[PDB]
């Protein structure tokens, strides 16, 4: 029978009445999806900052954030302590389509984030003079219907991300995506509590009580949280999850996945970091 999540009530998107489940809601999900949704800003703004300075320093924190999630351990655990015990294990990409080596995680936990563009290497990120070129180096010319690599790694549609030179708002959003083979309320609550203790979010009102089961057939700026941030995954492409799992030879044809509520994170960066992150050749380039 399907897993009983007592505290979070279930919810269904395509048809499946629940008489209390006869209609496609039978087995365990292919995987649970956990989004750590990050909003970041260089809160004290100055003149003389270039458009790139809007996002380079916020993006530089993805590496420490990814390390925190992967090294997080639930002290005083009654069943699961670390992420390795709970996350989805992937082994090898398809034998063809190895061109995405060192851009998608090969061995270990399925964990996606912008840092994958630089192999989760802060030094490689620092030695990069044009973040936009690196980000777009593998997008198609709109000739491929599946989800693009940028969408897969960022977790957002792309216009919400704010990573562009014409960003008028100084708040940039991205996401870290975790695929979990098992559901553990204690561990997930521990991870959520840790992230909101480290990075409290301003009057964050995100919903936290519904798991969505999806079945696939066939001046100074301030960070705000609102209804536009609720269920952000719903604004990804339809083929997003099937294409993500197809890259690893996992099929969602007659089975479903379970998307959990997102964990909010808010990062405020100061001019000292915004400068220390700056690449020397962009100071005299424009």
């Amino acid at each position, epitope marked *: 029978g399907p897993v009983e999540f*007592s*505290t979070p009530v279930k919810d269904y998107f395509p048809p499946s009445p629940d008489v209390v489940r006869p209609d496609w809601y039978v087995g365990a999900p292919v995987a649970y999806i956990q989004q750590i949704f990050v909003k970041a800003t260089v809160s004290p703004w100055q003149k003389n900052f270039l458009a790139v300075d809007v996002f380079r320093s916020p993006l530089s924190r993805v590496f420490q954030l990814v390390e925190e999630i992967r090294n997080h351990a*639930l*002290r*005083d655990s*009654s*069943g699961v302590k670390s992420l390795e015990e709970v996350c989805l294990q992937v082994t090898d990409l398809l034998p063809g389509l190895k061109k995405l080596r060192n851009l998608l995680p090969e061995h270990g936990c399925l964990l996606l984030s912008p840092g994958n563009f630089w192999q989760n290497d802060r030094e490689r990120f620092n030695a990069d003079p044009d973040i936009i070129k690196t980000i777009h180096q593998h997008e198609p010319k709109a000739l491929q219907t599946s989800a693009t690599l940028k969408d897969l790694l960022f977790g957002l549609p792309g216009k919400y991300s704010g990573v562009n030179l014409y960003n008028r708002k100084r708040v940039v959003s991205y996401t870290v995506t975790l695929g979990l083979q098992r559901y553990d309320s*204690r561990f997930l*609550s*521990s991870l959520r*509590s*840790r992230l909101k*203790l480290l990075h409290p979010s301003p009057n964050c009102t995100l919903r936290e009580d519904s798991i969505v089961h999806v079945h696939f057939k066939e001046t100074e700026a301030e960070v705000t949280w609102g209804a536009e941030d609720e269920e952000i995954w719903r604004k990804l492409s339809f083929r997003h999850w099937p294409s993500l799992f197809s890259y690893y030879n996992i099929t969602l044809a007659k089975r479903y996945i379970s998307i959990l509520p997102a964990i909010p994170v808010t990062l405020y960066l100061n001019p000292q970091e915004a400068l220390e992150v700056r690449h020397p050749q962009e100071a005299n380039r424009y």
Partner: antibody
Amino acid sequence: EVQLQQSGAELVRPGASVKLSCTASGFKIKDDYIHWVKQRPEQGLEWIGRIDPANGHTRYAPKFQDKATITADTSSNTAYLQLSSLTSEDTAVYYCTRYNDYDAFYFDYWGQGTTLTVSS
Amino acid sequence: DIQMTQTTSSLSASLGDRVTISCRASQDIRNYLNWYQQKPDGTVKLLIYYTSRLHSGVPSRFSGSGSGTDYSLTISNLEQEDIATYFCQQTNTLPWTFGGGTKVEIKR
């Protein structure tokens, strides 16, 4: 709202065994750990152990290994602490509590406390 | 394993006075310090679970600060209801240890 009623004061002989009880109201013990703490005047609070009533998985401080035994009945929503091989050093106040945040691990709600005296 | 020590076991103050309790950990505890209040009746109540934060229902006159090994609770203006003992608990390494409480009393 949330209350943790404890049993009355207890008097027992040395070498005996006691079973203290802690009944929850306003919440289900399945949803949280239940902890026992020991207060002794002039020595300060100290942690005994905890139980996860959903799993029945207990853990103790190394001081009380082989001393304390924690159990829980979900139907009655009640946790229990059993003390064995009692001695004078066990005369103290025992608090039942829980926590609700699983990274901070703060004890949000406490019982009033049960005084246990061991004398012949 | 981790020993927490409060410098003063007693402290005398007056209504409306600025009060500060402090305690030190034997090793880094990574800001995992909670502050509890015990009344003379004996009932305990959480004040500052996390460094600097506040448990719901606690008056805003309570505050917390500190880092590394040294942490401090502060009462901006001592009220008559704030006569009690205060304990600091470390939740960093698994056997949680409390510090010997510090009592706060009025000036006799």
